[PDB]
Amino acid sequence: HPPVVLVPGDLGNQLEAKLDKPTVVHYLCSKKTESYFTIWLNLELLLPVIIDCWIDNIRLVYNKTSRATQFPDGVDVRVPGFGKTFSLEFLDPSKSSVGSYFHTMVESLVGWGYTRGEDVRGAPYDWRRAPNENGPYFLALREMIEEMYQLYGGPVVLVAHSMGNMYTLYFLQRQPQAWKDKYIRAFVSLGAPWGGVAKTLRVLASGDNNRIPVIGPLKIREQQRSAVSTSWLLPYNYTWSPEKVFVQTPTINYTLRDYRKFFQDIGFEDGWLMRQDTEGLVEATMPPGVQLHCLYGTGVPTPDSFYYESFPDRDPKICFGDGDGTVNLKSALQCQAWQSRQEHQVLLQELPGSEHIEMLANATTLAYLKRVLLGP
Ligand SMILES: *[C@@H]1O[C@H](CO)[C@@H](O)[C@H](O)[C@H]1NC(C)=O
Ligand SMILES: *[C@@H]1O[C@H](CO)[C@@H](O)[C@H](O)[C@H]1NC(C)=O
Ligand SMILES: *[C@@H]1O[C@H](CO)[C@@H](O)[C@H](O)[C@H]1NC(C)=O
Ligand SMILES: *[C@@H]1O[C@H](CO)[C@@H](O)[C@H](O)[C@H]1NC(C)=O
């Protein structure tokens, strides 16, 4: 059975930090730590008041001159567990029941005879950034794939979830065809937002605390805006018509042709600069050039557009379309367009009723993967 590399989505792996800050936003925030500590996912950092300290440390700072992000003064961030799986199996190291992400799938793989850290490895990354600021990650990923090929005697299967699919596509678009034919067996795509997702507009405008309901939407909005990856996943014109209204208010409509105005009007001009930096990174029309298995959820109400009575600081009414709860059906179907640009097969698998995160622990998903890995 072939070696496997797992690529997570947004919020999809642990992050660690170390501090030596010149100033803090409250006296109760720690200025200095002697070693690295878990900054994601650690529930104690997310309580009211203390959450201000967390935001101050986990935010990225956007530099308009360099068109690049930096960490706050005296803050360093590390991605643990590269080449292992622990940091994407469980988001909170203190805690099994909360943060369980790739754990169920890795348990299945291990039951099928895989060994963590050897023929199954994780490729976690700083998911706050888009691929243009994760160069070193892609070098490490290339090297790890080559090593696994040599050690385990064949090409690797890449298995990616959500935004991890866009990271993986970026990587594959930049490797020569001869390299991919030698080293990549297949690419299994789970819940890929190839065209962006509509709910990114609500996230940027008013915040989204649906995961983290103990925290205020206006507080978490600060983190979500600071992450380049958020603006990278705004809807794209290769999926959506420029005349589709994503956000309606009493006096103005916003389509994907109105992003500059949108960012002005929500008070977040840096987001527009981030979108310009990132909108071209994955070419809409360049196929991956490998056997692709595109798995997407349907039949789950998925935010499609938003009506604001008062914009942007009051919660909107939501209009729902088809998809997996997060990824709109239209964005997930992008993979089929690549079939006419590449010779390798593109296989579609609809997963009716399968929710965005739950698809990773779903029996039908795992049965499909088993067939890909272990054969008939
Ligand atoms: C922002 O970028 C410019 C050019 O790279 C530089 O002059 C300035 O110091 C940067 N800000 C920092 C390092 O805080
Ligand atoms: C916004 O668009 C909808 C239909 O897409 C329309 O009913 C509404 O009148 C428009 N509002 C404005 C201010 O253009
Ligand atoms: C599609 O959107 C891109 C930005 O992603 C923009 O460059 C382009 O003008 C749009 N139109 C066409 C025909 O691609
Ligand atoms: C698992 O996915 C299947 C088929 O794609 C779906 O019918 C089922 O509802 C999912 N499991 C759960 C708990 O939703």
Contact of 146 with 180, CB cutoff 8 Å: no
Ligand 3: nearest atom to the Cα of 256: 2
Which method resolved this structure?
A: X-ray
- What residue spans define the domains of the chain? 1-13+80-196+281-300+322-376, 14-79, 197-280+301-321
Rg of the Cα trace of the chain? 20
Structure tokens at 21: 């800050």
Angle at 100 between CA 189 and CA 45, to 5 degrees: 120
**88-93 — which CB contacts under 8 Å span 24+ positions?**
88/6, 88/8, 88/12, 88/13, 88/14, 88/122, 88/124, 91/11, 91/12, 91/13, 91/14, 91/40, 91/41, 92/38, 92/41, 92/42, 92/43, 93/14, 93/38
Contact of 85 with 117, CB cutoff 8 Å: yes
Spatial distance between the Cα atoms of 322 and 302, rounded to a whole number of angstroms: 6
Our answer on whether the CB atom of 331 is closer than 6 Å to any ligand 4 atom is: no
Q: Angle, nearest 10°, between helix axes 259-266 and 199-206?
A: 30
295 alpha carbon to ligand 4 midpoint, in Å?
A: 13
**113: how many CB neighbours lie within 10 A of its CB?**
11
Model resolution, angstroms: 2.7
Report the length, in residues, of the chain.
376
166 in a known ligand binding site? no
Structure tokens at 100: 């369980």
Which homologous superfamily does the CATH classification assign to the domain defined by 1-13+80-196+281-300+322-376?
Alpha/Beta hydrolase fold, catalytic domain (3.40.50.1820)
Question: Which of 166, 231, 236, 237 to probe ligand 3 with, by most ligand atoms within 8 A of CB?
Answer: 237
Q: Is 313 annotated as catalytic?
A: no
Residues 6+ positions from 254 with CB-CB distance below 8 Å: 201, 245, 246, 247, 248, 261, 262
Spatial distance between the Cα atoms of 154 and 134, rounded to a whole number of angstroms: 27
Spatial distance between the Cα atoms of 238 and 168, rounded to a whole number of angstroms: 19
10 in a known ligand binding site? yes
**Residue of 255, 55, 69, 292 whose CA lies nearest to 172:** 292
Contact of 360 with 189, CB cutoff 8 Å: no
Q: Is 105 helix (H, G, I), strand (E, B) or coil?
A: helix
Side-chain-facing half-sphere of 67: CA atoms under 13 Å: 8
SS (H, E, C) 188-251: EEECCCCCCCCHHHHHHHHCCCCCCCCCCHHHHHHHHHHCHHHHHCCCCCCCCCCCCCCEECCC
Q: Is 349 helix (H, G, I), strand (E, B) or coil?
A: strand
DSSP state of 300: B
Structure tokens at 79: 């991605």
The alpha carbon of 170 is separated from its chain's Cα centroid by a whole number of angstroms, namely 13
Structure tokens at 129: 């950034």
Nearest CA to ligand 2 atom 8: 253
Classify residue 320 by burial, with Cβ atoms within 10 Å: 0-12, 13-18, 19+.
Answer: middle
Nearest CA to ligand 3 atom 9: 237
- 267 φ, ψ to 5°? 80, 35
Residues in a beta bridge with 69: 62
Which helix (H) or strand (E) segment holds residue 29: the answer is none
Q: Is 324 annotated as catalytic?
A: yes
Structure tokens at 274: 């981030």
